[PDB]
Amino acid sequence: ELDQLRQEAEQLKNQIRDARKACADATLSQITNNIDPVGRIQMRTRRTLRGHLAKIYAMHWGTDSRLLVSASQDGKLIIWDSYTTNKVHAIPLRSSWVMTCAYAPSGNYVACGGLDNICSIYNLKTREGNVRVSRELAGHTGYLSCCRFLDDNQIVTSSGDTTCALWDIETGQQTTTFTGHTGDVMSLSLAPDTRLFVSGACDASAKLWDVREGMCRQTFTGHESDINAICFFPNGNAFATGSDDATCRLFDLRADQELMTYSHDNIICGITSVSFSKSGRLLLAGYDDFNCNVWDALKADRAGVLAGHDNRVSCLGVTDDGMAVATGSWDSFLKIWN
Amino acid sequence: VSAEDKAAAERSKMIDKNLREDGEKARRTLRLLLLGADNSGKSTIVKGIFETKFQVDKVNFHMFDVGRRKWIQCFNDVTAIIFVVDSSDYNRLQEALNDFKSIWNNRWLRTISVILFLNKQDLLAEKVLAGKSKIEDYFPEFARYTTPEDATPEPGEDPRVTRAKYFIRKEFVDISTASGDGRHICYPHFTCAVDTENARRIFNDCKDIILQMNLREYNLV
Amino acid sequence: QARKLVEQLKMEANIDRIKVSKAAADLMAYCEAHAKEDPLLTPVPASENPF
Amino acid sequence: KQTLSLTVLTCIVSLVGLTGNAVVLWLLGCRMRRNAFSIYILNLAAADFLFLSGRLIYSLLSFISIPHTISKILYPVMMFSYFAGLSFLSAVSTERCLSVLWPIWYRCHRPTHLSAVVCVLLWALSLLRSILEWMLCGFLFSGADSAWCQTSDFITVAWLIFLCVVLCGSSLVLLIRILCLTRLYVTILLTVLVFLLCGLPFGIQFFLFLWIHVDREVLFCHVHLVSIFLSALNSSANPIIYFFVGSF
Numbered sequence: 046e047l048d049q050l051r052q053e054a055e056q057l058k059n060q061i062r063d064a065r066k067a068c069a070d071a072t073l074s075q076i077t078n079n080i081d082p083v084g085r086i087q088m089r090t091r092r093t094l095r096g097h098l099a100k101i102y103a104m105h106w107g108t109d110s111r112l113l114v115s116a117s118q119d120g121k122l123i124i125w126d127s128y129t130t131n132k133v134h135a136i137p138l139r140s141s142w143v144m145t146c147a148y149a150p151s152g153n154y155v156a157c158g159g160l161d162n163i164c165s166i167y168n169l170k171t172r173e174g175n176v177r178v179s180r181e182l183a184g185h186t187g188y189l190s191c192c193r194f195l196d197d198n199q200i201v202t203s204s205g206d207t208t209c210a211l212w213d214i215e216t217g218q219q220t221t222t223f224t225g226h227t228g229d230v231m232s233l234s235l236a237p238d239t240r241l242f243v244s245g246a247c248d249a250s251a252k253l254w255d256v257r258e259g260m261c262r263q264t265f266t267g268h269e270s271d272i273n274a275i276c277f278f279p280n281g282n283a284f285a286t287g288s289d290d291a292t293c294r295l296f297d298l299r300a301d302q303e304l305m306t307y308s309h310d311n312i313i314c315g316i317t318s319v320s321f322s323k324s325g326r327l328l329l330a331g332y333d334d335f336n337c338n339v340w341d342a343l344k345a346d347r348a349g350v351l352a353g354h355d356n357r358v359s360c361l362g363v364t365d366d367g368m369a370v371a372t373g374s375w376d377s378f379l380k381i382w383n
Numbered sequence: 384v385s386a387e388d389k390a391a392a393e394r395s396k397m398i399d400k401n402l403r404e405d406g407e408k409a410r411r412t413l414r415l416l417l418l419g420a421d422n423s424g425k426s427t428i429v430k431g432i433f434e435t436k437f438q439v440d441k442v443n444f445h446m447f448d449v450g451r452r453k454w455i456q457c458f459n460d461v462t463a464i465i466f467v468v469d470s471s472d473y474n475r476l477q478e479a480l481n482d483f484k485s486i487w488n489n490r491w492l493r494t495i496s497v498i499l500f501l502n503k504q505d506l507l508a509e510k511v512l513a514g515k516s517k518i519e520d521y522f523p524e525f526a527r528y529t530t531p532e533d534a535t536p537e538p539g540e541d542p543r544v545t546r547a548k549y550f551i552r553k554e555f556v557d558i559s560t561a562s563g564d565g566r567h568i569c570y571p572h573f574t575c576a577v578d579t580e581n582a583r584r585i586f587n588d589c590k591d592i593i594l595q596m597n598l599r600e601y602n603l604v
Numbered sequence: 605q606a607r608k609l610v611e612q613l614k615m616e617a618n619i620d621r622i623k624v625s626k627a628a629a630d631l632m633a634y635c636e637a638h639a640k641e642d643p644l645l646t647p648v649p650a651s652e653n654p655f
Numbered sequence: 656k657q658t659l660s661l662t663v664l665t666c667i668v669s670l671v672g673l674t675g676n677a678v679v680l681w682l683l684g685c686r687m688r689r690n691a692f693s694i695y696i697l698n699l700a701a702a703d704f705l706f707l708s709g710r711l712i713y714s715l716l717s718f719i720s721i722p723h724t725i726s727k728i729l730y731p732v733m734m735f736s737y738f739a740g741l742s743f744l745s746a747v748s749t750e751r752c753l754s755v756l757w758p759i760w761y762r763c764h765r766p767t768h769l770s771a772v773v774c775v776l777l778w779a780l781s782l783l784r785s786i787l788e789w790m791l792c793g794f795l796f797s798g799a800d801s802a803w804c805q806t807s808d809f810i811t812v813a814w815l816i817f818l819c820v821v822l823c824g825s826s827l828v829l830l831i832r833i834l835c836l837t838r839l840y841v842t843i844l845l846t847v848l849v850f851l852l853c854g855l856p857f858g859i860q861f862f863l864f865l866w867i868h869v870d871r872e873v874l875f876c877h878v879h880l881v882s883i884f885l886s887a888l889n890s891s892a893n894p895i896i897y898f899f900v901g902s903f
């Protein structure tokens with residue numbers, strides 16, 4: 046019955062919470078209190094990428110740490126060259142309202158999507174030089190919030206219909222649909238071993254999935270508002286979530302609970318983007334107060350600000366070699382920090 | 384510099400030209416956004432994304448509808464938001480005020496004005512004059528409301544329905560004047576489902592929006 | 605209805621949690637093993653930097 | 656006696672605006688939006704900065720003993736900067752009138768780089784004026800006659816009146832349109848009165864009194880020390896009136 050199952054579920058839900066407390070023998074701050082602090086970090090702007098005439102909602106680095114893609118409401122993606130600021134490509138888009146862009150590891154395809162509900166995979170290299178839609182991937186009911194390639198044949202996308210779908214590009218059809226969320230899945234991050242991925246939604250839940258099995262292995266509930274960003278730790282056994290409550294939290298899988306909470310009294314605005322560094326020592330986080338913050342992933346110590354944007358930072362990214370950090374705001378600018 | 388690098392430099396410069404030229408065409412088109420519940424006559428005014436294009440007085444207008452919890456952040460840079468409300472279904476009128484309160488008080492729409500269309504006012508005249516449904520059964524304050532003698536621009540228009548119109552509008556403008564701080568203004572209008580003059584009304588209101596936007600640029604308002 | 609919800613809850617319950625002590629040990633161990641390869645942490649001479 | 660009264664006051668007022676002007680000149684360089692209005696103010700702060708630098712040095716050189724050679728370089732910088740700034744107050748008001756008279760055109764169909772180009776023309780026009788003053792009054796006609804210079808003083812007074820007609824007319828047309836809103840009246844009247852009786856009275860008193868003749872008893876003790884002081888009050892309050900009001 047509805048109440049009979051609820052009694053079984055409520056006791057089970059209490060069991061998981063109770064069993065989760067049979068493991069917290071110590072806290073992250075206590076175990077890591079006696080280490081050398083990072084100290085002040087003074088990273089400066091090295092390049093500014095002008096060219097966008099509207100708000101910027103996404104960017105993504107390539108796997109060579111040299112080429113990056115940037116989406117904007119002007120209706121065009123731009124594949125920049127961060128070393129020399131040239132504009133390698135400029136792809137016009139059918140729909141101006143785009144929320145996500147992605148760059149394939151092979152460097153051959155670039156994806157995008159937004160309120161048009163369609164995922165648009167573009168081909169970078171072909172005959173005649175022009176860049177045209179390789180395939181449009183529809184089937185979703187809500188707005189495409191995040192896209193991440195797995196290979197040149199697989200893409201994983203999360204939308205506002207509370208579901209994430211895995212696609213075969215050649216077929217153009219969904220292979221696995223991941224249900225289990227009750228809200229808009231606005232972020233997802235891929236494990237380095239491309240076998241697991243996490244997703245954060247407006248239900249204040251960070252769910253970990255299985256790319257092959259299609260099931261939801263764990264469910265992390267420690268936040269209090271909508272999770273706007275999520276990113277895997279470089280080891281692949283932890284992730285950081287940034288909600289609107291001005292708090293970043295570092296979770297873990299083998300412990301299956303929260304280990305740290307990064308928050309300060311002065312910062313009251315939401316958290317837009319979060320990513321880690323190559324060593325997993327620094328947690329970068331974007332905010333609505335127009336500046337980035339550099340946190341300590343092991344001491345929860347605020348350690349720096351990248352303040353150069355007139356409007357809110359909407360995206361952030363760390364190169365695959367730990368060489369640079371790119372920041373994009375609604376003021377139509379990308380600043381390559383270092 | 385090398386030989387291919389200068390060829391990559393020229394490729395960037397040409398892309399810069401198309402980027403800057405395409406931006407000019409964007410500056411000559413005004414973007415809008417349509418909002419409203421079902422059976423509100425949303426799609427029959429000027430006559431996911433379902434775009435609509437029209438021009439009045441040689442200014443292009445671009446109108447969007449979605450078919451609003453958190454995707455509304457994207458429409459932060461629209462000229463105006465077109466809220467459309469049924470003025471005859473007194474059952475769900477309160478849910479329309481609650482809908483308008485959130486749009487007005489939303490963080491990302493602080494500097495976006497709202498054009499408010501009180502659609503299906505032909506049914507409103509028929510309902511109140513028929514003598515069957517009473518507004519007081521849905522808003523107790525109606526029985527103690529007087530038609531303001533300052534404004535009576537309704538010609539060839541019944542007196543009993545006149546009191547209802549200035550009460551429905553009042554319940555939407557008090558919200559606008561509650562917490563607006565003069566950053567954005569609400570423009571109410573009364574429309575039927577046959578009026579072909581609605582494209583003009585957006586033009587006149589979008590002219591005042593830009594005029595205020597220009598005044599604030601010069602620290603005059 | 606809720607049977608799918610309680611089917612997942614049983615599956616999530618039957619996993620092998622470990623203590624935070626070993627969780628934090630690995631996270632500290634990873635950073636200490638890669639603190640020389642993060643130029644965002646340790647500034648690099650401008651000769652080697654690409655910006 | 657009376658010299659130390661206004662000269663000391665002029666220098667202090669000069670330093671108040673000179674450092675304030677640089678703040679505006681520094682604050683607008685950080686910005687990357689650079690709307691149409693900010694470009695004129697940015698060129699007004701730079702133009703006003705040179706004027707106070709000339710006036711701070713000239714007034715300070717009155718306290719201690721000063722030579723005569725430098726006075727040949729401060730003057731044709733002071734004037735080149737003085738007339739340029741006045742033409743930007745007129746330019747700013749003209750664009751306020753257009754921004755209200757034709758709002759759709761000013762935000763949609765207006766050329767983007769219109770502000771940048773017109774600022775250069777006013778800079779050029781201020782430079783054509785200086786060469787005409789130097790050539791037609793000085794070495795190029797030193798021995799010819801002393802009645803060629805009065806033409807350069809006549810054009811300069813005519814130029815001054817034109818900037819007043821443009822400013823006053825542009826501010827008035829905006830007011831008529833609005834009436835046909837409290838900070839509007841205060842800002843428009845302030846930008847007109849401060850121009851007419853703080854920056855205008857210098858130049859219209861220095862140049863009319865060379866084209867004409869007047870008694871020297873009051874030419875200096877009444878309408879030169881005071882005029883040069885009110886001149887240093889306009890060019891200091893412009894950053895406050897036009898930019899820093901938005902900061903509070």
Ligand SMILES: COc1ccccc1S(=O)(=O)Nc1ccc(C)cc1Oc1ccc2c(N)nccc2c1
Nearest residue numbers: 726727728730731788789792793794804807808865
């Ligand atoms: C370009 O300077 C010139 C040019 C011509 C003669 C002398 C000078 S000056 O070197 O003496 N400048 C100067 C500086 C300061 C003062 C207080 C007076 C000066 O004398 C002038 C300046 C401008 C004059 C003008 N516009 N019309 C007529 C006579 C003028 C005399």
